[PDB]
Amino acid sequence: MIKVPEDLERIGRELRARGLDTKRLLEEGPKLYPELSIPDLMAIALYDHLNLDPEFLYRLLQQSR
Amino acid sequence: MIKVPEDLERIGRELRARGLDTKRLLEEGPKLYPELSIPDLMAIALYDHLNLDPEFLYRLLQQSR
C-alpha cells in the first residue's frame, strides 16, 4: 500500500486525524490497515509525531525490504 | 542483538546519550549498530523520543519477524 512516500504521508495524516497518539496508532493502525507491515506502521508513527521527511522514511522502508 | 526488551532500552539510551535526535539516530544508528535491522532502529527511535514501553515495542518487533 506504500508504493511512494505520498502514501506514507496520506495514511499517517488519516490515522492521526482520528485522534490516535503514537501508542494508540501502533495498536489501532494494524487493525485498520491490515495490509501494512509493522515497519510500515512504525515509519508512519515517526512521521506523525516528529514530522520526519516522508522521503527519508520511505527510503528506510525500502532498505528493510 | 535485541533478544529482550532490555536490549532495546539499553541501545536506545546509548544512542540518545550521544546527542542524536530522531533523524540523526536513524542515520547514525545503522552505522554504529550494523547488527540491528531497520525495524529495530525505528523501534529504538520511538522509545527514545516518546518513551513507549519497551515491552510493547519488543512485542511489535517479534510480530514483524
Give the three cell numbers for residue B43.
523501534
- Which residues of B are less than 8 Å from A49 in CB distance? 49-50
**Cα A27 to chain centroid, rounded:** 12
Among A21, A28, A38, the residue to mutate for chain B (most B Cβ within 10 A) = A38
CA distances from B30 to A6, A63, B21, B24, B36 (A): 25, 11, 14, 10, 7
Give the CA angle between residues A24, B12, A47 to the nearest 5°. 45
Q: What is the rounded distance in angstroms from the CA atom of residue B44 to the CA atom of residue B11?
A: 7
CB B7 within 8 A of CB B47: no
Q: What is the rounded distance in angstroms from the CA atom of residue A13 to the CA atom of residue A44?
A: 9
Resolution (A): 1.8
Torsion of CA A25, A30, A32, A37, to 10 degrees: 120
**Cα A55 to chain centroid, rounded:** 12
Angle of helix A5-17 versus helix A22-32 axis, rounded to 10 = 110
CB B18 within 8 A of CB B11: no
Q: What is the rounded distance in angstroms from the CA atom of residue B45 to the CA atom of residue B7?
A: 13
Query: Does B60 contact A at CB distance below 8 Å?
Result: yes
Give the CA angle between residues A34, A39, B37 to the nearest 5°. 150
- Which residues of B are less than 8 Å from A54 in CB distance? none
Domain coordinates of chain A in residue numbers? 5-64
Q: Beta strands of A1-65 (E only): which ranges?
A: none
Query: Does A43 contact B at CB distance below 8 Å?
Result: yes
| Distance in Å, alpha carbon of B56 to nearest chain A alpha carbon | 9
